[PDB]
Design a protein around this ligand. Structure first.
Ligand SMILES: Cn1ncc(C(=O)N2CCC2)c1C(=O)Nc1ccn2nc(-c3ccccc3)nc2c1
Ligand SMILES: [Mg+2]
Ligand SMILES: [Zn+2]
Length: 313
């Protein structure tokens, strides 16, 4: 009850910043997550014994893949924490509970393959879920862990509060499907510009939370250049493995996934910052002004990729 988590001084300060890197010590990530729940939600939100047991079951159901791993899960949660802490009064009590858990859980049991590869492989999950294949899986896994004995972190909620929080988490995890991001942002663009954006409108809140999920999920592009650059190696390590598996199915993979086309990576990153990342944080910043530093960091990293192309590195 009177038992706070406390971090070292440098982490205690840096963790409040959008560009915070959680570092290479795995054993500290659970404590960092709990610290973030306690300041974001309150020390009263979750039964510490049940939280801890849930965190460790979640960790266990992430795989030893280069990018879509336990470190990605905690990174995406930290970004969401920073968004919640910089927009104190905009989110309900259930949203604060739901979204950090959504972020921790959003890539549960990821194998490092896209929805496309599952469909071309004809993986069982592609017959079970026709669209947002892995993301329906990740939600499924979240519900399973929630139903392990002693793992129900939501048990002190009413029956309908419980149902609202699982619906927040479901929508939040589905929206991490980048295929759904493009239309979500165009809608949020029109609504904000024409003036019709209404945060009392639940359909509107869903959309804004979706955009936050995309922003948190992509947040490798909002770190200091060296974190961004080394994270991109893990991202391509998965992409090029998938490319190899595509070749093993007698399908020529897209250049993104073809390790023979490494030289085109810098130009590929540009396309991605211009088509996905910059517009995501642009629209996010218009809806939530205090998230501007994510936009600023993204633009800094675009400029760094431009320098890679000009042989300046
Ligand atoms: C940085 N970051 N963060 C999340 C994701 C991402 O998309 N996902 C999905 C799972 C996490 C990425 C990323 O780098 N995306 C991209 C997107 C498009 N292209 N196109 C190339 C390319 C084209 C030709 C030749 C060479 C490379 N490279 C990329 C990389
Ligand atoms: Mg995912
Ligand atoms: Zn993710």
């Amino acid at each position: 009850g009177l038992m706070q988590f406390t971090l070292p001084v440098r982490l205690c300060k840096e963790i409040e910043l959008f560009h915070f890197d959680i570092g290479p010590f795995e054993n500290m990530w659970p404590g960092i997550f709990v610290y973030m729940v306690h300041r974001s939600c309150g020390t009263s939100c979750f039964e510490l014994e049940k939280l801890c047991r849930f965190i460790m079951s979640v960790k266990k159901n992430y795989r030893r893949v280069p990018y879509h791993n336990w470190k990605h899960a905690v990174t995406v949660a930290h970004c969401m924490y920073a968004i919640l802490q910089n927009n104190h009064t905009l989110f309900t009590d259930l949203e604060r509970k739901g979204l950090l858990i959504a972020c921790l859980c959003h890539d549960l049991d990821h194998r490092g393959f896209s929805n496309s590869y599952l469909q071309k492989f004809d993986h069982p999950l592609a017959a079970l879920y026709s669209t947002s294949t892995m993301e329906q899986h990740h939600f499924s896994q979240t519900v399973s862990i929630l139903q392990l004995e002693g793992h129900n972190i939501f048990s002190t909620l009413s029956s309908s509060e419980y149902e609202q929080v699982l619906e927040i988490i479901r929508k939040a995890i589905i929206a991490t499907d980048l295929a759904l991001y493009f239309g979500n942002r165009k809608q949020l663009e029109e609504m904000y510009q024409t003036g019709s954006l209404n945060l009392n409108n639940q359909s509107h809140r869903d959309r804004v939370i979706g955009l936050m999920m995309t922003a948190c999920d992509l947040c490798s592009v909002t770190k200091l250049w060296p974190v961004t650059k080394l994270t991109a190696n893990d991202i391509y390590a998965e992409f090029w493995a998938e490319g190899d598996e595509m070749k093993k199915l007698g399908i020529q993979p897209i250049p993104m996934m073809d390790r023979d086309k490494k030289d085109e990576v810098p130009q590929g990153q540009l396309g991605f910052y211009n088509a996905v990342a910059i517009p995501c944080y642009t629209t996010l910043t218009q809806i939530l002004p205090p998230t501007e530093p994510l936009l600023k960091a993204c633009r800094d990293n675009l400029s760094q990729w431009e320098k890679v192309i000009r042989g300046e590195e």
